[PDB]
Amino acid sequence: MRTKLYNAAYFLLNNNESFGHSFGIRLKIVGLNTWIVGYAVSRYYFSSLRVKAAQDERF
Amino acid sequence: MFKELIHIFRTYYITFRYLKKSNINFLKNLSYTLIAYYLIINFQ
């Protein structure tokens, strides 16, 4: 059975002011939360790093 | 807040649709327990 397909609406709709206005707020909140979580993860990651070793050192 | 994160993941990710409301609630309970533990432990 050949599965049916469709043309995604957002690929063929003229850009509108409503999309912009609403997705702007959604992206603002997404950016805020992502920035907070990424800052936490960045602090964790950098603090996880090892200490600098000597030159040509084994173990 | 937690509710909103779950709602966004459900509405945008097709795979996340697999989870029941019961599994979501279990994640909610575990997250609340972990948050309480974090708050308590940081001060110890």
Binding site: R2, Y6, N7, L13, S22 | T11, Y12
Partner: protein
């Protein structure tokens, strides 16, 4: 006899995606034997064509150059001119011709709307693109599978239910002109689905979330004074994300060719649901 095909399918999918991005908006000229001089006098329509019944067919734009001085100025008129004069295999739904049935809803050049009451850019330079409703499965050409829309419409019980017998049976359910005008601008929906196919929440969750049109119909049956199942309907639409998924984008009221305002109806429904949830606690005590 068959074997695992995860790798072949994956490679084919990636390669096809890349190629389609390179060759997006594939176009085939209906009549290549046209002198570029002639095309100065004719407008170009790019019509989406796809016949899943034929195993060898794939989606594609077809270019038709037509003289716009031979038929009236509407999308449906141009589509039917192309069908009758150029290629009568084109498929589209059409009943009313005056924007009442709502069958001809299509993506008329970037905007979902009824093709029978929508004009097209008269300029001969900019091409016009006619495609089916976006997020609906395509059956053939400009004909989509609106079955799910109707199935959702059925779930709202769109029939007057009354819990109190009529006092005399020789009269009509009383309703003052105010309780009637409360429905004005709300019962004119023709179930064209043009709005709901433009709602992003309906793009993401077609099944769990009822469309703006169906929810507007539920609101119409709720605000109606003659029906007595107000709270029951409110509770029924309050399940999971049948209504909560609406994000008040407002595109529904912008696309509605009938001029209706489903966004306002959904806002009122949300307010009524919130009040219902609160007073299920406040009242019963």
């Amino acid at each position: 006899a068959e074997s695992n095909d995860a790798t072949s399918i994956c490679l084919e999918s990636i390669s096809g995606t890349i190629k389609g991005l390179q060759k997006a908006n594939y176009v085939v000229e209906h009549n290549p034997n046209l002198t570029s001089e002639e095309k100065k006098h004719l407008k170009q329509f790019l019509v989406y064509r796809y016949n899943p019944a034929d195993p060898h067919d794939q989606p594609k734009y077809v270019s038709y150059w037509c003289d716009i001085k031979k038929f009236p100025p509407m999308f449906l008129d141009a589509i039917l001119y192309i069908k009758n004069e150029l290629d009568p295999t084109l498929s589209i739904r059409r009943s009313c011709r005056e924007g009442i049935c709502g069958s001809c809803a299509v993506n008329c050049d970037g905007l979902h709307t009824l093709a029978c009451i929508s004009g097209f850019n008269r300029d001969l330079s900019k091409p016009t693109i006619i495609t089916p409703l976006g997020h609906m499965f395509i059956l053939k050409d400009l004909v989509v599978d609106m079955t799910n829309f109707y199935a959702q419409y059925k779930m709202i019980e769109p029939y007057l239910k009354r819990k109190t017998p009529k006092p005399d049976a020789n009269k009509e359910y009383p309703q003052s002109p105010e309780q009637r005008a409360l429905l004005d601008g709300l019962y004119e929906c023709v179930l064209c689905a043009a709005c709901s196919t433009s709602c992003p929440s309906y793009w993401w969750h077609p099944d769990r979330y009822l469309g703006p049109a169906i929810l507007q119909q539920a609101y119409r049956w709720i605000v109606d004074s003659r029906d007595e199942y107000t709270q029951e309907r409110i509770e029924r639409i309050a399940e999971d994300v049948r209504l909560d998924d609406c994000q008040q984008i407002g595109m529904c009221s912008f696309t509605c060719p009938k001029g209706l305002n489903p966004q306002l109806s959904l806002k009122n429904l949300m307010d009524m649901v919130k009040d219902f949830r609160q007073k299920r606690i406040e009242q019963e005590v």
